[PDB]
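Ticket #837: bound-state structure for chloride ion.
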Amino acid sequence: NDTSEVMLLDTGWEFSQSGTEKWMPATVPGTVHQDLISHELLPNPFYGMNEKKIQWVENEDWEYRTSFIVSEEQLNRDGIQLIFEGLDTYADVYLNGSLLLKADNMFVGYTLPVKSVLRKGENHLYIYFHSPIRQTLPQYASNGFNYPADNDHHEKHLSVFSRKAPYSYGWDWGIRMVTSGVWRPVTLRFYDIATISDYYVRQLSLTDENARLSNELIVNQIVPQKIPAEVRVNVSLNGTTVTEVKQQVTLQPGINHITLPAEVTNPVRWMPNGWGTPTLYDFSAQIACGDRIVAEQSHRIGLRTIRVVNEKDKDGESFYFEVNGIPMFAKGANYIPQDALLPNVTTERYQTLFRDMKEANMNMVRIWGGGTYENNLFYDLADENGILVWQDFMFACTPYPSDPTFLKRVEAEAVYNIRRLRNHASLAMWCGNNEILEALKYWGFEKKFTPEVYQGLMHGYDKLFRELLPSTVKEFDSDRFYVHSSPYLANWGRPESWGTGDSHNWGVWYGKKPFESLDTDLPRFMSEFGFQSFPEMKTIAAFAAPEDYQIESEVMNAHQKSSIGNSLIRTYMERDYIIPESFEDFVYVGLVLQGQGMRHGLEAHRRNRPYCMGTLYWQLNDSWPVVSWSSIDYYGNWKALHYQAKRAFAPVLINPIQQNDSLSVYLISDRLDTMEQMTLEMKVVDFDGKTLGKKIQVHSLEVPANTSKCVYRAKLDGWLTPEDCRRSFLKLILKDKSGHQVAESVHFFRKTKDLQLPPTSVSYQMKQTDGKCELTLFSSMLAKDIFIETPLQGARYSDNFFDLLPGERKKVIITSPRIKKGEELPVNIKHIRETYK
Ligand SMILES: [Br-]
Ligand SMILES: [Br-]
Ligand SMILES: [Br-]
Ligand SMILES: [Br-]
Ligand SMILES: [Br-]
Ligand SMILES: [Br-]
Ligand SMILES: [Br-]
Ligand SMILES: [Cl-]
Ligand SMILES: [Cl-]
Ligand SMILES: [Cl-]
Ligand SMILES: [Cl-]
Ligand SMILES: [Cl-]
Ligand SMILES: [Cl-]
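RESOLUTION: The complex was predicted; output attached.
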């Protein structure tokens, strides 16, 4: 609500491969690749072997153009700014014969004063995008060594020279699409007197009784006179004013700094997912000049404390988050770009992914440093879903340059994004990079370079990650934690270091260690651990013809970038499952495997609180159709791992853990309230539905807030025979004093491959309407790890990848806007015994 007028330059753009004099319609925001696809000038880059066929684009320059009209009335506004929220990457901006800007950083928004260049009538904007490959060949040639960036899929590692999304050059789950273009919106704003260049709501203090805020405004006045104004900040909640403050000023030409204190008595705090409401106040700053509101800016603000506790202690060095005074065990995942082509990621897709996180009970997401600083919508959704955000700076897995020019470019992206993000309730901490010091010290790299260059890399590390970035956080976001790297010291190979900070476990997967190692190999905080899976068949069909379905085939090694890939999946599967003959059935067990194995680790982490205070698995999501460590595939389909993470992160969890022919049962709660007079009930049930022995009852159980506690141990010997352990399972239920159920769990006493699973039909009734299909499933005998498979991309399930227990009916709701009444939903139910003879 101000007097400015904004024109979106988001239609009527054209592009041209440089020097062909051929122009065609473009979509802006967008990418060169998508503009080509859309005129059938590229094949589907995700389909089959098209990866090799699309690389040529990275070697060309690309130009974009648009025309707009400006009226005499508009040209008579005091000020007119052209805003680029993003240019990828080396971009020459020309308006009406003027070079406005030589852009050189994908991660920076540019605000350009243009009134003096604009013309009544037609106006011509041209943007020239230099190939970031050809732009940096001479830079590389001058360097006289290749930076060891193995995820840059090219002999010459040119990524490290450019402030560009690292993953664009490739990665061990990624396609190489080194694209260009106007990747975020272009707006022209026509205004009077000034704009608000920045609005920071700085929390000075927070108690139950009062919140103290400093409203800090930078106002850019574009007229040459002194202008009396009143600054106003309105604090509102759900449309109702809570407090109003104002301040007389006389704005000077150029930058003005304005500071207004405001207080909220009896503040309603922002809570993370699980602990209550993620309450957001509306803070609105207005600049009023007489009758007219010349500038306004708002932020949604959450009133909370977040402290990162990173202190020497008996165990080494703690690493945990205290939210509103309470240690909060972190439960979430590492997030990567949702697409090879970032502007194709829509509002719906961002909303669905946060629905996926919130429904799996997560309270944290790490924006890993080989992606982007996410758009404003991402942080807004993290705010309104109660997800803490761990923000890496966009450096990952290689040393980077540290020359003055390079540092100046990084300082600019750090100041831009810190100011862009520092008003979000969700933002919890900054991290300098992903695994750069680990890589410098341990991946070797030392053996690859002269000592001279090595020493240059080591001092270069300090200049960027221990000086420039920490000092910048201290200046612009002084109450947020910064750490130079994840992991900061813990090395997976060095068990003595595990008590010290966050860990990236590479024992599971790279080191081939069994999932069971995660019960003994305990970190203070798991920032990264993971396991691959092939995605389900409807997702393979999207990139592969039926001809092409094989475990180490051509396209199934092309769709794996890790190279050890498909082999590790078979090696791990054989330990716990019978390997099926059919590709389809192997795909299904592979989803089950990744699910069970990772859930086991996620449970170990919560079980070992307080020693361990969080787990973020690698990885939530995918950028394209591919074999990856994801829990959600590129089309939004939940793998078994997503259902399993949800189960393992449930606020109260019954965790039966069997080691050394003994069972222990823990009760784990992340609730803020302590539960009293609880009963654990267990009974041993055979795969036919017959109870073995008596129900076991443990009464008088306290479940204190934010603890893991053991409530029952029993040696297996004398309780069940080896034959029994292959033939039955443990059913566990937790109930309050009044016998109402608050949690259940199922426990198997042997590896699935060692189970005597009876042959069985899962039968179902199906009630199908618009958008919806309600299945009632039944099997008189145990059906293990059932997978209700439909060919409908993106279908959501109330539940899936669960055991259907003997005799016990189970309701499952499947939903999709594409479910039409009368076209019966194709449904194929798989279970483990079905996969071998
Ligand atoms: Br201007
Ligand atoms: Br400006
Ligand atoms: Br000032
Ligand atoms: Br955006
Ligand atoms: Br060298
Ligand atoms: Br530091
Ligand atoms: Br055992
Ligand atoms: Cl504070
Ligand atoms: Cl005043
Ligand atoms: Cl040397
Ligand atoms: Cl609960
Ligand atoms: Cl176990
Ligand atoms: Cl329940």
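RESOLUTION NOTES: The longest strand covers residues 194-206.
TICKET STATUS: resolved
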